[PDB]
Amino acid sequence: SDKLKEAETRAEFAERSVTKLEKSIDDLEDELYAQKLKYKAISEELDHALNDMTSI
């Protein structure tokens, strides 16, 4: 009884923790993608500038 109470309790903590972890993971990944897309927009600004520089 002690063993299974312990196991279920720590398992519930594990489930809540892992779900919080998944929210964290998604937020981090989406923020990373947003930042990377901003960077690529900046890169295409630079690439338009380079196309101008094709003047040389």
């Binding site: 998944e22 990373l32 520089m53």
Partner: protein, 66 residues
């Protein structure tokens, strides 16, 4: 003397500019569009993972609720 300034300056005055423009064009083309498309793809996979997690969490909470 002063006659190698042409042969060391005029060369890179055009070749370097054109080559760097080529490098910038190819790097932007390779990088930006592929990165945005890949991030969208990973976002779609992430949404599917979120749906799978919600379904599994709900079914397990339904069964285990005693």
């Amino acid at each position: 003397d002063f006659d190698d300034i042409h042969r060391k300056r005029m060369e890179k005055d055009l070749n370097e500019l054109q080559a760097l423009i080529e490098a910038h064009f190819e790097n932007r083309k390779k990088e930006e569009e592929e990165l945005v498309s890949l991030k969208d793809r990973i976002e779609r996979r992430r949404a599917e993972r979120a749906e799978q997690q919600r379904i599994r969490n709900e079914r397990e909470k339904e069964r285990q609720n005693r």
